[PDB]
Amino acid sequence: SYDRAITVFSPDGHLFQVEYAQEAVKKGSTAVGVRGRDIVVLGVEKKSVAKLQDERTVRKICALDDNVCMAFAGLTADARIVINRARVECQSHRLTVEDPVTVEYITRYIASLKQRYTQSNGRRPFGISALIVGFDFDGTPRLYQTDPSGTYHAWKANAIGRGAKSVREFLEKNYTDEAIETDDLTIKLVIKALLEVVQSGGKNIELAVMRRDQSLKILNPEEIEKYVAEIEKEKE
Amino acid sequence: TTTLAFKFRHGVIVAADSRATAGAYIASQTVKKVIEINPYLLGTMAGGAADCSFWERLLARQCRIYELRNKERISVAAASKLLANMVYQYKGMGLSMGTMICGWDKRGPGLYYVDSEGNRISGATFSVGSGSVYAYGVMDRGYSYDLEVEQAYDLARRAIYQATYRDAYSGGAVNLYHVREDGWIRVSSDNVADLHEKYS
Amino acid sequence: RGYSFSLTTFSPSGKLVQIEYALAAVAGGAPSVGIKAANGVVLATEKKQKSILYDERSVHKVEPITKHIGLVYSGMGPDYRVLVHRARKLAQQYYLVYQEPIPTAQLVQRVASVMQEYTQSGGVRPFGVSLLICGWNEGRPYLFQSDPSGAYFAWKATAMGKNYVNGKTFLEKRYNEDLELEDAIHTAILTLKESFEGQMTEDNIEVGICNEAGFRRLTPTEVKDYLAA
Amino acid sequence: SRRYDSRTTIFSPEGRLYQVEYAMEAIGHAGTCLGILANDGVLLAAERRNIHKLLDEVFFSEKIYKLNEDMACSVAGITSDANVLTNELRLIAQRYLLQYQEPIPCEQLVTALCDIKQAYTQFGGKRPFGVSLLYIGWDKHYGFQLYQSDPSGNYGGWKATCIGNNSAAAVSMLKQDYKEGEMTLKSALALAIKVLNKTMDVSKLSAEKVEIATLTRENGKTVIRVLKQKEVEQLIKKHEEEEAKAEREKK
Amino acid sequence: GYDLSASTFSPDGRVFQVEYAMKAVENSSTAIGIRCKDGVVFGVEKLVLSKLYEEGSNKRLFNVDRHVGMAVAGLLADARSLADIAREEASNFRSNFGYNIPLKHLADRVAMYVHAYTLYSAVRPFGCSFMLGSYSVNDGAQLYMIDPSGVSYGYWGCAIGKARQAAKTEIEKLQMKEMTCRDIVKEVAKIIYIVHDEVKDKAFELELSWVGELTNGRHEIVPKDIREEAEKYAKESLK
Amino acid sequence: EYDRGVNTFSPEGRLFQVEYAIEAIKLGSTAIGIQTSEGVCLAVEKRITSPLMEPSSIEKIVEIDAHIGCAMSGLIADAKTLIDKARVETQNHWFTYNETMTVESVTQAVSNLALQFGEEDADPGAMSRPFGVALLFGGVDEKGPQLFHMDPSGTFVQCDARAIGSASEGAQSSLQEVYHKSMTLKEAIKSSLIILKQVMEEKLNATNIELATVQPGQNFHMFTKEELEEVIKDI
Amino acid sequence: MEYLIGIQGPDYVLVASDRVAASNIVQMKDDHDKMFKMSEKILLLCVGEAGDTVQFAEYIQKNVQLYKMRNGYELSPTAAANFTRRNLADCLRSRTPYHVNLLLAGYDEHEGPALYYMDYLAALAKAPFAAHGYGAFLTLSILDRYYTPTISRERAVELLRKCLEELQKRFILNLPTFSVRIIDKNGIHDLDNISF
Amino acid sequence: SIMSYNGGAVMAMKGKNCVAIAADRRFGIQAQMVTTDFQKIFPMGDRLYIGLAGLATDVQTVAQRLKFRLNLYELKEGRQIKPYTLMSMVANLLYEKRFGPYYTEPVIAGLDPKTFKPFICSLDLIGCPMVTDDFVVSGTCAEQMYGMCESLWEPNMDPDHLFETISQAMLNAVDRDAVSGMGVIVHIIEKDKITTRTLKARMD
Amino acid sequence: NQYDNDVTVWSPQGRIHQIEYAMEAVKQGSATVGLKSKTHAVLVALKRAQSELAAHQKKILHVDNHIGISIAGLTADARLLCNFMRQECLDSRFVFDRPLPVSRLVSLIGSKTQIPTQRYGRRPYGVGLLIAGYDDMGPHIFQTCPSANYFDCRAMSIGARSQSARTYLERHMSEFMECNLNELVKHGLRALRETLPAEQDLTTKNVSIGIVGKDLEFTIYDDDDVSPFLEGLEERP
User: Fold this and answer.
1) What CATH number has the domain bearing residue A73?
2) Which of A94, D103, G76, G191 shows the greatest Cβ crowding within 10 Å of its Cβ?
3) Glycosylation positions (chain F)?
């Protein structure tokens, strides 16, 4: 087998491959996740609308299990690999423990996988960062982030990919108990947050929501258009 | 052996004899068949004592590792499934094991019966052992979900006593355990001789 | 153990430079030519030797993979030999499985798969040969060229080695579909004469033919008779 | 030895794999291939880049590669890696048929091959597969589908798309011409010929320099067909006549 | 950069890693083995780096089987590993074929083990050249030397180390074939003493071994009495 | 560059990767631990990057067992594997020998993992590089309260009080100034938080630090926000 | 031996099972449920050796639900049946054969209701009605007599009750209560347990 | 025996430019009929049909493995398989599991793709092929089928005579075997068409 | 420059630079002194503390009842080699029911250490050990290097500033052979103290002693127990 150290320490103690993979994440399409009391929202920026793409195939917001969902930035193929591995872990965990997987558990599994690739022989880092949203058994909303490094944190709201720093500053300013209160307000908040980063606006975003004891639901294009028009009304 | 466990409104009772035998010879009359797997759930022994002890101790360490990793105590159902999956690997290799994994969780009081054959089942009343057949009848007549804690203690103690009276390979002292939401408590250990004085 | 990293990788342009260098190695090899007649297919190559001391009969560039398939090369002889060994093994695996002789196209596909394997596998250079594979199956002739890359092409007629472009032009000028195998042999020998750069003789060339009977390499006497005109 | 290692897998300082990109440049040079979805069918059309006179023509096609009863694929890139990938695709589909006794979904097969292609990027110290191939198929769940893949392992679903030489100009022409939901296979074939004439350097589409294939559902069975030289010559003549008629409109 | 691996050639067809490994043995102190009618005698100029080290430390006369003995030059670690390989080879031969291994076969096998390492990049050439010596009534006395390359040849007399050439000049003028072991040990001692350099090397301990008919086919260290007589003769001859 | 392998000594006798990893821990957040006769304290600075990041999830102190807890600095993702081994090792010790595992043994176990990294000729699953963390293990055993520091080099040393992370040098100077053998656990907690307040860039809050103690009587216990607020207001 | 029964209909499939579990001479549990919900519109009824039933069933369950998760649609009943048949047959000659007898029931929008039968040897057969266990011998003839391919679901429930009554009358073992579930286009619909 | 567990019978017969293969429909356990619509004859080509009898699990498994291998072969080659080639592939498949055998006895019946020359053969458990010019049979009722086919078979039968011969033979044979019956399906293969029929039979 | 980075590469001068660097690794370590007499073998170490608060890093380890080691260099590699040695001695007692000979053990250490020096993607064990034990032959002291060569010593020191210790030991070697245990350990302590800086002096905290003898199984005398041995030790101008 190809046994080689792709990742190694450098002078000043930085893992250059991990940093470069985070740079690769930065290039990717924006994603934004906003935790909410009875809802958790995920949004993602369509890199471009080819006008020939089938919208179904290109979706970046995927259900790891019925109770948990994720969105990603970075290399889409690597994202698909980790998504499938997390799905099989979800099913195996359910098999072994006779209970649904918690968001912390699946986040830890994805993080351990990414960290293994950062330290194992002959494997590059997974060039992705993921926003993992789900509802715990109690119904507590959960939002976590993962990085190529393997570190994982919980965020009340966070963004990944291109424009992540700017939109993160924006929702740092704009996050409040008032916006979290209404599910429509959470959706409008994330739509605004994305609207800064995406120049085209309107149909250039993909948005999804999950509610307590509900499956992942992707809003219709006309529905997000209605929300976007609502934002236009709010400005005046 | 005779072991007994049932669920009632104020938790789960677990009872067992203290006799261990090799053929006819009674090797020990003071074995602690109820195994304290951890502070929050506990198990019983029937069949091979070595098999039960070893596999339940392995379950104990796995449960503690799960607690440390997930920062929450394992559910009784999940622990029963860990034990079942563990023993199924060695199916057909001579393991003789009978276990009743008893505890609380978010569900409520939980009682699961696990076997070397592979059965894992939840039930309000279970009894596994040589004298389980005798214990079952008295337990069934007495048992109700609405039962006082003292009444349940009496039912379990007398059930194990009658099973010891009829069955040759069950005897010694009736250890009794009560699971409460905080955790298990070792309520009594009565010798069947003084119980024979009491009941008769 | 052995190295496990691929020695061939894409260059900034998008080219596998090791493969193109192997093609250059093939082009430097001795000429070889193939022509597909209606009733057969002929394989011919120059067998020029360094000196009279060499025994021409000892080794043969034209070799039978099977009763009905044989192939010839231009390039590196050792790589050619390991390839013909593996090709014979592949044909025999096919025969053990299916109990019919391997079709020419399928054998070409399998050896091309091998050649691709050594392109991408770790710590191995590409093969330094291009093979010409001739076969008769289902009452039809076949000629195939397999490159170092692992890509196979079907030719009515073609040339390899030195001056292969000039030879291909000569064949395009001189080829007709209705050629019988004898006339096709004469044409291929003329092509080799185009670039032989010596006095041709039975010893210094090889010819091989495939027909309904099967693959066979012409004897020295037969190629002498053919060379007479 | 580290000294001789090419280190295909490593990231770049900018964050690019760069072997995948270099292979995409290779695919850019290759023969043009397009696919157009239609209401009643889907087509594959491609340039026969090898058009030497002496070359024999004995095959289903040079680059149409039937993979299953219900799907086929066209190729642009390194032909040997393409052969390997198509063999792997057929094995994957037949394994699915063995397990489930149903024909494989088109997207599922595409995902399996793309998982392999990604895996070559992730690890193993091996060169990426220098192939991009178009997939066409029909499945019970979604109907007629057209998919594309890349060396990176990313895949997409396209109503119409092109790969290979001048794929950018091809998609630029396709976007204006394509009518979403209003295309039939005949109009799609005409659009394919127009796009092929635009993309291909040859002033005239010879009808020996193209291989065109169509997938359709007839009587509950997929039929994958390669249009014969007479049919494609008729198409090219009809396109030339239409271009002349537009030339009449010009004056 | 043609000398950084043993899976490489110079443009003039030399494997430089092996030559560098030969420089390694040329650095280390001389060892001489002289064949004779009765048997083989080995001698080593074992330098004492520190006064602290005990006598017999860094032994350079290994015993690879009852009937055969090794003498080594170069890296003593590599020499110890080669001695382990030779011992295993002799043991395996006795196990399979039922008798004491012949010296020629043992030398060939250990030489092939050495040669295996010059080929590949992953492993480096051995940093030891060593001599094998044995006696058997059927085979007679035999002395073989194996270089770091893996070449194995039979020598009536041999030397390995710093003063290989000068030791060979002295060894040539011996009439070895007529001589017996009892005189040959004295000759070995005088040659070791003459080749030793007092200035460059602070001190040495003459380490001697023989195999032959006098020992009845065992490699053994010289008895202290005979070694003392030999050393006295050597210092007398040195003048 | 990849000019040199993972396993190569420098001319000065130091593995380059180990040296770089010991440099890497200096990037990490500061932590302090103190050993007292009444127990040991473990304290860390959370280093909250942004306000929205929920401060609970940062876990730079963890429970290896009831009688051992440890705190970490450096690449915490690397520390996750080491604490996993520590947990399974102490539980294996309980399973086999029916007793608690001493802190020296646990630190010996986790330290054994380090310096087992190799490019090749190692295993199918093996560490390519050294671990990038330094861990402070604290627990009470038959010997008593003990604290051990495990570096990326795999050298484990018992220490009365130690600081690991970015400001470890100044924290160690302050700890040498403050510490005395007769120190009580409350005074040690106060002193540790004082030194953490000195080094921390952000002003100390209940949110931005984490503290835990394990004492002879009780298990490893993490001070809740109320306890932190009480102690900090006391400061 | 536990009893499984299935009766297919025009637009439905009815499935029923005994609710007992037994150790030697004693029924340890009276509410044991032998129906496994592999997806929204398929059920897998499982009887056989102890342990093998639950282990194999849960494996098939995880694989089917993983298929749903990754693809976005559910396996059809026929595909699920062939999948479990494949997994069972693969282990027949292995070191770990599953002695498990299955009855798989499902509905599909395209292909309508389907009931499938598998033996421990892993031979798969679609059936209009089928049963497993020793009670199958008693009850199949009643199904043969009174079944019609156009039976309404109420009539099917009545036929099921007839078969279970025959089991009460003749079958030596005690099977006091039986679960009943029906799969239709809407989904799996639980029905009141037939009881005696 | 193991093969008698599920029963079943298959027969094939050769006529003039025509082939006929027939088999019973019963799927059962040792004495319990489960279904009367088991597929023991699988179409392995445009005009090539394989019929398997033995253990039902091995019947289905071998059919599926053969279709896997054959679909790969046809896609790679680009040509439909020849009957002798299918025979050899089946023999290889069975002999790969020489130990732990598949308990099934194939009967392959079809016309050549190009020549349209009738072909029939049979293979044992471990793949000894047996090509035959008149008829081949496999199953529990093999002796009955053998005697009946020996008597009724005539050389150069037309399609109608082949149908009548094989139909009478299968009916009369399976009626005298306990574990086989419950109907018969027969496939007559001709160059221009395949016609399948179900026969009236004693359900006993 | 080119030759140093890998162990397999032989330099043009006939040397492997990597093993020399590994030897520099042991030179950069807390000093130890190994010493023996006719009836006893002692090991002494300057346990070195990183800080006033820190403990001094167990220099002396137990291999078996009759063998023990003093480590210098990378303690992780030292512990790995110690595990190997302990397993070898355990296997010897299990199989043959005898203490493993000390010379045989150091031979096994030599082979194990030698295997990395000759292969790719592997490094020398960056440790030098001083091995002390009592066998049937008598007291033995052995030194091992990162290079697999090992030596048999009357007395020896390794680590930082150990040349002065070797100087004192070479001067006083004659006295050591016929010596009581207290006088021998005191000699070794003086030799060790030579390496220590002039500002610092030996203390109960920073000294560890390891002793094995005919009747004494290998024993490590700690900070409290060194006080009898360092009760003398007059002065060090």
Assistant:
1) 3.60.20.10
2) G76
3) 192
Give the 3-state secondary structure percentages of chain H, helix then strand then coil, rounded to 5. 35, 30, 40
Kindly tell me the burial class for residue H192, based on how many C-beta atoms sit within 10 Å of its own C-beta (0-12, 13-18, 19 or more).
Answer: exposed
Handedness of CA F170, F176, F177, F182 (dihedral sign): positive
All chains having 3 or more CB pairs closer than 8 angstroms to chain G: A, B, D, H
d(CA D77, CA A139): 51
The answer to whether residues C60 and C54 touch, using CB atoms and an 8 Å cutoff, is: no
Per DSSP, the residues of chain F read ---S-SS-B-TTS-BHHHHHHHHHHTTSPPEEEEEETTEEEEEEE----STTB-TTT--SEEESSSSEEEEEEE-HHHHHHHHHHHHHHHHHHHHHHSSPPPHHHHHHHHHHHTT---SSSS-SS--SS---EEEEEEEE-SS-EEEEEE-TT--EEEBSEEEESTTHHHHHHHHHHH--TT--HHHHHHHHHHHHHHH-SSPP-TTTEEEEEE-SSS--EE--HHHHHHHHHH-
Chain H residues with CB inside 8 Å of G116's CB?
Answer: none
3-state class (DSSP) for residue B81: helix
Q: Packing angle between helix A183-197 and helix A221-235, nearest 10 degrees? A: 80
> All domains of chain C, ordered by start, with CATH?
10-228 (3.60.20.10)
Domain coordinates in residue numbering, chain H? 1-204
**Identity of the residue in B88, B91, B136 whose CB atom sits nearest the CB atom of G26:** B136
Length of chain H: 204
CB proximity list for B22: less than 8 A, separation 6 or greater: none
Name E30's bridge partners.
none
What three-state secondary structure class fits E158?
Answer: strand
Calculated CA dihedral for residues C58, C61, C65, C69, nearest 10 degrees: -130
The CATH class of the D2-250 domain is alpha beta
Alpha-carbon gap, residue E132 to E117, rounded angstroms: 20
Determine contact, residues A201/A228, Cβ cutoff 8 Å: yes
The vertex-I53 CA angle with I47 and I54, nearest 5°, equals 40
E42, E33 contact by CB (below 8 A): yes
Positive or negative: CA dihedral B145, B148, B154, B160 = positive
- Residue H110 β-bridge partners: H48, H119
Range of the domain at E237: 1-239
Tell me how many residue pairs between chain A and chain D have CB atoms under 8 A apart: 105
Q: Do G69 and A94 touch (CB under 8 A)?
A: no
Number of domains chain A contains: 1
- Our CA-based measurement puts residue F7 at a distance from the nearest CA of chain D, in whole angstroms, of 13
Say how many domains are in chain E. 1
E strand or H helix at A81: helix A76-97
Residue B137: its H or E element: helix B132-142
The separation between CA H76 and the C-alpha centre of its own chain, rounded to angstroms, equals 26
Domains of chain D, residue spans: 2-250
Header resolution in angstroms:
2.9
Range of the domain at A121: 9-235
Q: Which residues contact D186 (CB under 8 A, 6 or more apart)?
A: none
Kindly state the tokens that stand for A8. Answer: 């190694």
Four-point Cα dihedral H128, H130, H131, H136, nearest 10: -140
Q: Write out chain A residues lying below 8 Å of G33, CB-based.
A: none
Q: Find the CATH number of the domain harbouring F196.
A: 3.60.20.10
Nearest CA in chain G to H2: G121
Q: CB–CB of H49/H43 below 8 Å?
A: yes
CA B37 to CA E41: how far, in whole Å?
73
| Chain I interface with F: residues with Cβ < 8 Å | 4-6, 18, 21-28, 50-55, 57, 73-77, 79-80, 119-124, 126
CATH T-level assignment (fold) for domain B1-200? Glutamine Phosphoribosylpyrophosphate, subunit 1, domain 1 (3.60.20)
The verdict on whether residue B46 carries a ligand-binding annotation is no
